[PDB]
Amino acid sequence: SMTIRFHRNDLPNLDNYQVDAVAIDTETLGLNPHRDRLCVVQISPGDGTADVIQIEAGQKKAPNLVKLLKDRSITKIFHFGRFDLAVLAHAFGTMPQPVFCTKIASKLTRTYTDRHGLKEICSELLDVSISKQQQSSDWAAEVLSQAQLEYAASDVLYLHRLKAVLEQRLERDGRTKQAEACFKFLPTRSELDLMGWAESDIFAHS
Amino acid sequence: SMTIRFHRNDLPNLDNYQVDAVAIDTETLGLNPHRDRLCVVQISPGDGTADVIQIEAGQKKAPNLVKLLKDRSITKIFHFGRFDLAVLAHAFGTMPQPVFCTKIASKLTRTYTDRHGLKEICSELLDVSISKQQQSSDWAAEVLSQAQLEYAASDVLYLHRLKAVLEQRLERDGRTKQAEACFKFLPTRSELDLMGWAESDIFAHS
Amino acid sequence: SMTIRFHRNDLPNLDNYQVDAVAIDTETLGLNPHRDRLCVVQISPGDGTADVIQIEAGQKKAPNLVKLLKDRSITKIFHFGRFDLAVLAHAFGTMPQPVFCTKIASKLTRTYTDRHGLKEICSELLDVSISKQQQSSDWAAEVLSQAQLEYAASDVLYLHRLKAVLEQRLERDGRTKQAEACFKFLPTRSELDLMGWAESDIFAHS
Amino acid sequence: SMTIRFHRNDLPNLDNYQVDAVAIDTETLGLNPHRDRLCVVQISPGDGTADVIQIEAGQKKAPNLVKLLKDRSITKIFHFGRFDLAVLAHAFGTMPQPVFCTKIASKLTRTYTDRHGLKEICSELLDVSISKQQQSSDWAAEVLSQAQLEYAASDVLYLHRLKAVLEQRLERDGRTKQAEACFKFLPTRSELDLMGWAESDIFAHS
Amino acid sequence: SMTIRFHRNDLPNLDNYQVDAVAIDTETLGLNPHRDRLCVVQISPGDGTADVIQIEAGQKKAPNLVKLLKDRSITKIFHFGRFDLAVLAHAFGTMPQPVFCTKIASKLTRTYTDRHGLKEICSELLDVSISKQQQSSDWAAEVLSQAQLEYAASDVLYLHRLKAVLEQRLERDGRTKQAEACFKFLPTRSELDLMGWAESDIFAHS
Amino acid sequence: SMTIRFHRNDLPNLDNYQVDAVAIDTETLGLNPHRDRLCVVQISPGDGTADVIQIEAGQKKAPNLVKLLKDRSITKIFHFGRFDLAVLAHAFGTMPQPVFCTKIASKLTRTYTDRHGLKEICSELLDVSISKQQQSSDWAAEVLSQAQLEYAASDVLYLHRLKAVLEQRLERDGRTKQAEACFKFLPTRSELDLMGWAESDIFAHS
Amino acid sequence: SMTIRFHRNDLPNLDNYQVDAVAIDTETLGLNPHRDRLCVVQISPGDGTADVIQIEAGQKKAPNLVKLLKDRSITKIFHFGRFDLAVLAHAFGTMPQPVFCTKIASKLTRTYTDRHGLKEICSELLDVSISKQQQSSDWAAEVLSQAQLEYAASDVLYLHRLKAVLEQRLERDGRTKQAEACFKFLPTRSELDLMGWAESDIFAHS
Amino acid sequence: SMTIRFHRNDLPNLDNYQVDAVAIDTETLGLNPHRDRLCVVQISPGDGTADVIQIEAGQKKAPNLVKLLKDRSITKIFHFGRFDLAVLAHAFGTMPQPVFCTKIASKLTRTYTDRHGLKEICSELLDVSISKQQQSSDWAAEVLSQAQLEYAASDVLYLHRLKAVLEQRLERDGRTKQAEACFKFLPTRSELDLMGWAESDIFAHS
DSSP, rough: OOEEEEEEESSSSSSGGSSEEEEEEESSSSSSSTOOOEEEEEEEEESSSSEEOOOTTOOOOOOOHHHHHOTSSSEEEEESSHHHHHHHHHHHOOOOSEEEEEEHHHHHTTTTOSSOOHHHHHIIOOOOOOOOOOOOOTTSSSSSHHHHHHHHHHTTTTTHHHHHHHHHHHHTTTOEEEEEEEHHHHHHHHIIIIIIIOOTTTSOOO | SEEEEEEESSSSSSSGOOEEEEEEEEESSSOOTTSSOOOEEEOOOOOOOEEEEEETTTTTOOHHHHHHHHOOEEEEEEHHHHHHHHHHHHSSSSSOEEEEEEEHHHHHOOOOSSSHHHHHHIIIIIOOOOOOOOOOOOOSSOOOOOHHHHHHHHHTTTHHHHHHHHHHHHHHTTTTHHHHHHHHHHHHHHHHHIIIIIOOOTTTTT | OOOOOEEEOOOOHHHHGOEEEEEEEEEESSTTTTSEEOOOOOEEEESEEEEEEOOOOOOOOHHHHHHHHHTTEEEEEEESHHHHHHHHHHHHHHOOSEEEEEHHHHHHHOOTTTOOOHHHIIIIIIOOOOOOOOOOOOOOOOOOOOOHHHHHHHHHTTTTHHHHHHHHHHHTTTTTTHHHHHHHHHHHHHHHIIIIIIIOOOTSSS | OOOOEESSSSSSSSSGGGEEEEEEEEEEEOOOOOTSSEEEEEEOOOSOOEEEEEOTTTTTOOHHHHHHHHHHTTTTSSSSSSHHHHHHHHHHHHHOSSSSEHHHHHHOOOOOOOOOOOHHIIIIIIIOOOOOOOOOTTTTOOOOHHHHHHHHTTTTTHHHHHHHHHHHHHHHHHHHHHHHHHHHHHHHHHHHHIITTTTTOHHHHH | OOSEEESSSSSSSSSSGOSSSEEEEEEEEESOOTTSSSEEEEEOOOOOOOOOOOOOOOOOOOOOHHHHHHHHSSSEESSSHHHHHHHHHHHOOOOOEEEEEEHHHHHHHOOOOOOOOOHIIIIIIOOOOOOOOOSOOOOOOHHHHHHHHHHHHHHTTTTHHHHHHHHHHHHHTTHHHHHHHHHHHHHHHHHHHIIITTTTTTSOOO | OOSEEEESSOSSSSGGGGGGEEEEEESSSSTTTSSSEEEEEEEEEEOOOOOEEEOTTTTOOHHHHHHOOOOOOOSSEEEEHHHHHHHHHHHOOOOOOOOOEHHHHHHHOOTTTTTOHHHHHHIIOOOOOOOOOOOOOTTTTTTTTHHHHHHHTTTTTTHHHHHHHHHHHHHHHHHHHHHHHHHHHHHHHHHIIIIIITTTTSSSSO | SSSSEEESOSSSSSSOOOEEEEEEEEEEEOTTTTTSOOEEEEEESSOOOOOEEEOOOOOOHHHHHHHHHHOSSSEEEEEEEEHHHHHHHHHOOOOSEEEEEHHHHHHOOOOOSSSSOOHHHIIIOOOOOOOOOOOOOOTTOOSOOOHHHHHHHTTOOOOOHHHHHHHHHHHTTOOOHHHHHHHHHHHHHHHHHHIIIITOOSSOOO | OOOOEEHHHHHHHGGOOOOOOOEEEEEESOTTTTTSSSSOOOOOOOOSSSSEEHHHHHOOHHHHHHHHHTTTTTTEESSSSSHHHHHHHHHHOOOOOOEEHHHHHHHOOTTTTSSHHHHHIIIIIIIOOOOOOOSSOOTOOOOOOHHHHHHHHHHHTTTTHHHHHHHOOOOOOOOHHHHHHHHHHHHHHHHHHIIITTTTOOOSSO
């Protein structure tokens, strides 16, 4: 569609990515990055369109996407980037940075709730209703459905709007600096997950 | 004694602190920094001596100690600094930095155990036996005992040796960079505790 | 509307408050009184109308409201006042007293259920249906919605009726004196929460 | 012995009780006041002696002891009075008041520990070592042993000293008024236990 | 109605109770028999009608009902009689016997499910749909509603049919003798609850 | 019906079972094989039809079914065979082998979900909707309903299709050999359950 | 020794068993009666001697012992008979009755403790110290050690004394009738364990 | 010593390994095989001697040891081999087989205990006392102590004796065939741990 562009392996070029921030999510075969391969990278430049990239089994390279991940002048926006950063670094060898995580930002601003999921925060902060996929999905299937493409695009089409509102909320309640320090540490948090500390809060007493 | 110098309120001067790193621990009336006041700051320059500083109720200033806390050329070493950093910042208004935490370093190197306490790590890494205080102590008492001074000094007399060994272990097992990123975030972790997130892992999914 | 009067900062006068009891609830940015500021005070004189007062960030005074909180001849009615008392005392410096808590009264009379929420008790005791807000709300927003005003008013429009029924039930089942002693202690329970015992039952053995 | 006077049923007179405060503990057949009868009342006037009173099965009266329990000019000191107050009220029909509870006072002062037992607090605050009975005891036996008398006396011989130190600590750390309000509520807390709320914190949200 | 007869205090006579078994349930102010008084006794002779008896506060006698409870030639049927037996014995002084409990019988026959409630078993075994009361009810109210009378009658109108089917099932699967021994012990189980063992399985190892 | 053939005791012949694999499920009186007898064996040759066999109380033999269970050239397919294998071996004396378990295969392929039930996997992998029985069923009843026959047939009508898809998925993700080893062990896992280890993971450390 | 007589298979005669009560315990290969065979029966006539009987694998008969188990004029005393009754009935086909259980009696009298083990109760009630075996024992070994014989005898040498004291305590505290009803049900409790309800309190609500 | 031979990297030859079974244990930097490298392999031919082999960081080959691991005519004995098999396969690329696990064998024979550790089973089955290392050990240190060598040797010096006794016990209690099937599956259990199922019982229902 005009909203969703589908690609195999990689972005074909970076013509749509002359931007200062990109929105990213991924799909995998599960929550264990060492067992469960990367299957889809979905990315948006923030212009109301999304690119959905099917990643093949054994695929080691994605040079155009990786240029964006490495580019320190482009902020990579995620809603809970802790997992996606680990998956992307494990797949292609680059830990993306710098980052903004709308879930960490939500935890530091939406102090009146424990519901920090994407659907809930988009409804509350943006008045945008995104549908949540209910059945489980084999994201490694050779053929992805239009419904799958739409679900993947919905994960990234609104993160720039969400970041804009959350930045205002962080400033209003006085937590911009702490959020930024969390974003600076997040790539290390993801590295530590890959290294074997995924089940440990490294800052806990015991 | 020759090993332990006792002071009221503050260090009398910084003559013993022409160093690149200091070792710090604190004593309080309990684990709630907003309720339980700072009572003692114990600090060592790493030369086999320690200064034990009694902090009065309502004391807002400690200018010589605070110079060290602010000095970015001096690394502040703690064994679990997450609590002490919050207590010190709350008492005197300065978040100490930069820091090295031997407990975080232990968690990243001593992967074969869940025992990361000071007594255990000093025995294993330094062949130094420190006695652990068994009974509870009112650290806000007007008069501190020699036993209390000795317990407080034992917390700081060995942290430079511990840091030296842990740096070697971090290099051997390939985790120096991740440890350093943890140390850079730790002051923010302590700020977040004071701000109201003491019971939350900010990086957890939910 | 005729039922709901909206105000900034404070009641404009006490013309509507020549009464022996007032009904109060609050809205905040969350459940931590030290982190999460007071945002709204909703209050009713018991005449079927409510005042909804928007509290600004950093607001230290609300003299007309505070006159009511201090007035020992006016009983302050809450449904679970433990939290609101702490929030009000923290915001304006006065611990409201005396108080009547319809949730404590419910626990001492409705011995056949564990459901002591406002909606449930209003339905059972008053045959009044109040709608419960389902989505989370930023009560610190500059502009409050009519729906928010209606939710806040619903919290206080029925507490006088609820107190009247619960007083009858307390007398019927013989627990008036014990309830009154609970109400006398409740301001101290709220003070202890602010002081650092919010997670502790002070009367428990261990 | 000169330290311990043994009596059947009641104090023989109040000659030793021309005092402003008495220290009390009890022994029963267990922790359920409705099932497990009162067996012993131990009481001290604070002069370094104790009276140990054996209570018979079915005993409904103890007039000299009850005079002390009713006397509003005599403070009844307990270490955790919540249980003893319920047992005494159930046995003889009078809820003792006013009271001072050294365990509540410990919880409000000894903020650095979770160990609030009598042996621990006597060691820390008084430098007094009391032996703790290790084996279980049938306190309803017709014949009580000297060891049992000594254990019972040890529960009351030091509560006046403990109260004196805890009052100083409450003043030092600013919690005298809150402690006093807890002491005023404690008789109601015990009544509520007898009434059927022994397993419920009446002040909890849910 | 023709199905439901309402009475104050007691059955007016035993004309409808020339039977070998009666079906009984009760309503109280809650689950604590010592705190929560008996409010309603509902009873059926098994002929498709029910008597609903309102019990007053402080009522110590119900001679016609009690004749049935004492009559050893009449089996008292309950669905979970453990509670009702305790409540009835506490109210009127007679422990009813002999008994048949359809919930114990269900546990010994319906080995394929953990759902042993009255509504579920009536649907499965009898093809009878009974409506379950959803809101909480003050059964001590002076005036009981027709809905309350219908709920109470539904508890007893089908227990004879249920017992007939469960007896067949007990015989089919070979557990009649064990069920009967459970029924013989059940009055003691209820006595032990009143005596202070309500929270203990007396047959457990620890 | 043409889809479902009903039999008492055993298959009447093996005319429909000249196949290399059969699909099996069972119904019992519950989850304890020593207490809860086998009641129904449902089996399909994979041709879109099913045989539902009612097993009598005390039935020790089923020679035609048992020929299939013993035939090493016929793979017995189950969705979670651990229970059915134990039940069948206990009833007729033969541990069926070899086996394919679609639930183990699901756990080794559907790494993105914890929902491995038959209804969920048939929907996802086969686009087949099977209805799940909601009420509990006495499968030992003399007369089985058509609904019961349809539920039992639905358990086996699709396992050949499910196995075909799961074999493809096991090959795609590289786990065929591990799945096969699990299938070889499964009969022993079921034997160990019958022997007294039903609640123990024999491979766990402790 | 003079205190302990060892036998293979069975008592050689009943010359020592012309008594009204016997004390019994057993040893097995574990706590699962269906998996773990009976290995030893230890029995005392109450005269300060014990018989220790080694039971062979596959042994189905023990006629002299079984005469005692069946004899309704002989009370079988156990400390926690729930397990031994199941083991004995499973081994030889007779459920022993009538019984007295000193552990149930302890639970109904020693209301001040949760420690109802044999060693603890013998110390408290009898002033008898029995040594507890610390290492695990293969009770199915062909050759039993003298230490094993002494441990087994210690289980039965004191149960008559224990029963005598517990009967006095049951009378003193008014629970003789309830204890007797528990003893009458206990054989059924053991039957229900063998039947498949070992992990269920049959009298619980859910 | 004569009992313990130390080697770097690998066995120097297989002169001592002309045997049908070898006993193996390992030391690592922790319990995560992907993070925590293999540090020591200890192995015994069963002749009362042991070889302790220090494995270097990054060591990919150990050809003499690997010959033994691959040799299908040599049974590899472990006490809990699930972990060691994963570690060895991950280090050198060969999954050792066939295997005998004395911990699985203990679980299938020592049905009277939950203590299946090496020290406990050696004491009970062999009357051999092995000392357990109490402090934590950095097994990756360049220099291993004699105490470390002795601890490592103690893990393997007795496994042949243990296997001999456990084989007798498996035969006595009738579980040889089930144990053998467990041993055949164990290499797959270890593979599944490496593949990402270390925290899942693959045979559980859910």
